[PDB]
Structure formats: C-alpha cells, structure tokens
C-alpha cells in the first residue's frame, strides 16, 4: 500500500477491482482524489481545488450572461424611445379623410409598437436579468468557506502523517535497543542488568504502542476527511446541475419572451390594416367637397 | 333677369329650374366649384378652381411628408440592427462549455440573425414604400402650374370679353341719349341740320347695337370654352386625386405587410436557440468535464 501527500491509496499492484461509488454518472466524488501538480514545478494543488474553480467560474458565467441581457435591454429601450419619438412626429398631419385617419393610425401604431418593445425590455429585466444576477447572491463566499473546511481536514491529515513518521522512527530506531541487548550483553551479562532486556527492550515495545496510536489517529482523521470529502463534493455536483437547469430555464424564458414579444408586435398593425380597408377615395372626396365647395350652379349666357 | 359675378354669368338667384348635376351623387369636382371664393376677410378673393389645385398640391405635399416619416423609421431600423449585431459578436459568458455552452452561444448568434431580419426589413421599406412615395409623378409641380395657366388664361380671355361688352353697352346707351336728346330737339325748332342729325345719330344707335350684338355673342363663346375646359380639366384633377389616394393606400398596405412578415421572420430566429436548449443535459456536461479534468480515479485506504 502506497502513500502520496498524506493520503494512502492502495499500491499500484494487484488492485482489487475498485468499485466506483456512483457508477456511470461521472460523480464529483469519484474522479477527484489524488492531487495534481501545476504543469511547471510549483502550483501542485488539491484534488478538489478544481471543483471550486469550476463552481466559481460557474457563478461567473452566470453574471456575464446577466450582463449580456442588460445590454440587450438597453438596446431595446433605445429602440422603443425612438419609435415613440417618431410616433409623435407631426408629419403628413393635414391629410384629411379616411386616408387621413389611416395614416394617423400608422403614426400611432409606431407608439403601440414602442410599448410592446418596452414592456419586453422590462420583462427581460424581471424574468431573465435579475434572477441570473441574484442567484445564490454570496456564493463565492459559501464556496470559499466550503474550501478551507476541506483544506483544514487535509492539514489535520498532514499532522497525523508527521505524527506517524516521528513515531515510526521511534519503533525502528529503538529496535536497535532490542538488538543491542542480545549483541552487547554478550560481554557483561547476568549482573543487576534487570534493565537491558527488561527496560531498553521496551523502547521496542513502547514504540509499537507509539506507531499503533499514531496510525490509528492518522487512519481516523483521514476517513473523516474522506467522508466529508464525498458528501461535500456531491453537494457541489448537485449545486452545479441545479445551476445548469436554472440557466436553461431562464434562457427558455428569454426565447419565450422574445417569441411572445414578436407576436404582439406583428399585431400592432391590425388596426392599421383595419383602417386601410375603410379607405375610400370617393367618400373622402365627399367629406371634402362638402366642406370647401363654392356654388353648385353652372353658368349660362347673356342677356 | 340673370346675374354676373366676376365676369361669369350665372342665372339670377330666384326659382332657377333644378340644375341637373353633371355627375350626380359622387361629389364631382366639375359640379361644386364654379363661383369663386373670397379669403374669409375681404382680400384676397380667388378663383373657384384654385382650391382644387391647392388640394392637388397639398396632396403631393402629404405624399412627400409621408415618405419622410418612413425614412425616419428606416433610420431607426438601420440602427437597431447595427446594435443587435454588435451585441451578437460580444464575448460575454464565452467560456461556458458543454451543451449549455453551445446553447448560450446560439443565443448570442440569434441576435445577429435577428439584426439581419430587421435590416432586410429596413431595406424592403426603402424600396417598396419610401421611394414610391417621393417619386410618384415626379414633376407634378410642373404639370399643376401648367394646368393652372390653362384655366387662368381662359378666365382672363373671358374677363376681357366681358369688359368688351360693358364698355360697348355704354356705347349703346350713350348713343341713345344722343338720340332722344336729338329727336327732342326736332320737336322744338324743326330745321334741316337737326333732321339730318337725327338720321345720323340714329344709324349710330344701330351700329352700337349691332356692335353690342357681337360683343355679347363672343362673350358667350369665350365663356362656353372656359366652361367646357373647366369641366373636363377639373375631372382630370378629380381623377388624379383619386389615383393618389389609392396609390398611397396601396403602399401603406404594403408598409403593414412588410411590418408583418418582418415580425414573423423574427419570431423564427429562436428555433435554433430553443432546439439547442432542449439538448442541454447537465449530466452529459459533467461527463465531458470530469473526463477532461479528472485526477484521482482511485480512493484511499488505511495503513
């Protein structure tokens, strides 16, 4: 059995299968254990720190997306401001008659249009922009605490590692104290030396009692970092899936708003179309000749 | 017996028989404009046709103004499309990888597609609605002011025949005074000179009558040419106007049509986005990332 950076994997020999925790589905709690070194020589970080960077970049994407929608909204606003300003414009005003009414309704239909696109800007803000920004508001914080809570367990792993090395030398280097009492008692021997085989053999029996406790507490405070590793990577995986589905959801609402917006726009012409059917040249000629006529009597001769 | 205003003779405002309307019901230009009209004040008191021209003119004016309105719309559209295009190239949330990444990418593109649609529309507007409003009877300002002097000239040529009659009706009566006042001077001290003078200033009272004859006959003629020409070249105006109306109608109808199909093609630019959002699978992405960034594969043991 091997040991790299204070965590003991079994040795790369006759490896008993190793059943994956969560099969098929590429679990965060399965494919991240042993650490990884930065391609250079330094920056050799934890088999988890990447999960944080993924999480943080995630909440990051999220924000950039929202910023994008803001830009779209600003665009929209302006488009509406302009259609509005044009809709108030004084052009071709004095056109009288059914045709006049018709033009007028065109000039108005630009205002309707303006509204539609504006309302759309607002629903963008409401249903797409905000819920992206304000989704898990402080999250880089919850993540950076969820970080060093692991880091701390890895430190409490490394101290038990040092604790076993400076209590493994205690055994092996004081086993010279069992060997130097059968090899170096072979000179004097049999005297009041009730200490060479009795006492100094204990530094090879008290030091077994050292490595026992230190490897017990290493192995304990490892499979305590291990289990809180499993569960708080699963918590990440879950939170991630959740993020994806949230973004997907709100993007679907972006398309949805788009869709229904365009639909309400292509409808602001129906009043115009409606008035344009009622446009009758001859009726207008009436409503005008009535109002401006001069005499209906046709001249004769003399005297 | 029969009146005469501004050199044109209508029958007296008594019980004048019916007056068959030229073109009945339909308020024909050649029916309700004969007698002139005064500016509501006292001056200026203008011709009973000038208004028909002024209307034609206001017409081609309206026409222009309308084109200018559409222009503005087009400017607006051009801009909106430009901005949507700039945003479509925008780099936000780029590093989102995975099926969600592709989906987001397609959102950013749909803005370009959209932009395109709105531009294609600004164009269809310029071609099919703006231009045809400006360039409808391009020289109309020419043909109207020729059509003016054709009536106007016949009206001067009338007022002149009228003056010719009046100052030759004065001729008559003043050579009838020189008759009663020369027959009255016969009945006083009767001689030769004041007899031959009665023969003479009495033939001079028939030449003034055979003169008044022609002057009135020619008045009547050069009236019933202004009459005829009035009728038919008013009808020409009525026609032109109507033609205008339905031209404008038609092109507005097309404004709405373009509006319409524009919004329809816009509401289609989301189908790549919707289609891609359904292909969003968190677990698939977790696979494509855990594959490329995995480290540990093997899970720790004891000692």
Q: Any descriptors?
A:
Substrate Binding Domain Of Dnak, Chain:A, Domain 2; 9 helices; mainly alpha; homodimer; 303 residues
Note down, in words, how this protein is organized.
2 copies of one chain form a homodimer. Chain A has 303 residues and is mainly α. Chain A has a domain at 49-167 and 207-277: Arfaptin homology (AH) domain/BAR domain (Substrate Binding Domain Of Dnak, Chain:A, Domain 2). Helices cover 61% and strands 0% of the residues of chain A. Chain A has 9 helices and no strands. Chain A has helices spanning 49-87, 97-133, 140-165, 169-172, 176-179, 208-220, 225-265, 270-277, 281-292. Chain A is rod-shaped.
Order of helices and strands of chain A: HHHHHHHHH
Largest interface: A-B, 100 and 98 residues
**CATH homology-level superfamily of one domain in chain A:** Arfaptin homology (AH) domain/BAR domain
Most strands sheet of chain A: none
| CA radius of gyration of chain A | 42 Å
Q: Report the principal-axis shape of chain A.
A: rod-shaped
Number of strands of chain A: 0
The CATH C-level class name of one domain in chain A? Mainly Alpha
Helical segment tally of chain A?
Answer: 9
The assigned CATH architecture of one domain in chain A is Up-down Bundle
Computed structural class of chain A: mainly alpha
> Oligomeric status of the shown chains?
homodimer
PDB class: lipid binding protein
Keywords: phagocytosis, F-BAR domain, lipid binding protein
Assembly: dimeric
Entry title: Crystal structure of mouse GAS7cb
